[PDB]
Amino acid sequence: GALDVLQMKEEDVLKFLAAGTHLGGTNLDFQMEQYIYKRKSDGIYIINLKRTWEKLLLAARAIVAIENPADVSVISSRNTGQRAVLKFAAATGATPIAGRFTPGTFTNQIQAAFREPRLLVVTDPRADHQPLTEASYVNLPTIALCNTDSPLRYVDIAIPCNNKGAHSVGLMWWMLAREVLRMRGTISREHPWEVMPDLYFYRDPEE
Template structure:
């Protein structure tokens, strides 16, 4: 069975199986829901209680595009993942372990990618950022 129709089937099943307790847990945890106009393309449906359901098909397409970019880099050491916040550090480390990418977790030394005099200077061909606002 092709993957996209299978995803659509799963989306419909999950949409009907989504329980109120799960939604309440998300809200209690303070998980952000889509409020920005740029994110509307990733929304499958809006519920009446202002809960946004993610468009898994669109998200899957973007993940495939990102995977194509990552595998196009010949040397895995030229790929680097960065996360200064603890919420993204585990993801960066889990990505880096099997892929051979270089993880940068925790406090980031300014100038690592730009200051050639610095001992830790290096130029990755691809930089994966978990939170652009925090990891700039």
């Protein structure tokens, strides 16, 4: 949005630059091209950082529009997102799934794990492909974190970022939790937040 109270600050841009979020792959799909700045002299694509903040605020404006927070469902089958989805679902009251998704969880009405959500958020479209294709049987809207070579086939909001691993995946979930809590009125739009980004990251060498 145009508003100064929604503008991206220097201190967020330095946190993007520090985590590698702007660095894509060597390949580009034709659906992702509007999110790209340029290709480097070494064959790597640069993701446009202002495009990310608009698509992340549009995603937060979808998540705030659900009146019961337990109706939102949150997923990661790769390890680099598992700590991050567990912390996101603690900070705001969504339902997490981590590890293997069981086929038929959304469509086998009798099943012990059966559930019926209103919004679905996924960490990587190529890896999390079961809950994406299974959402096509039940009228379920979708948000996803997309790299330059991600296949867009059932996602309704794609957020441009490096999703390969490490600090970049944890930072995106932390920043999405910050803005949903801000615009619902639970924390300040000006005072810094008490939760450090480093709480969401995956398994750097411990000692």
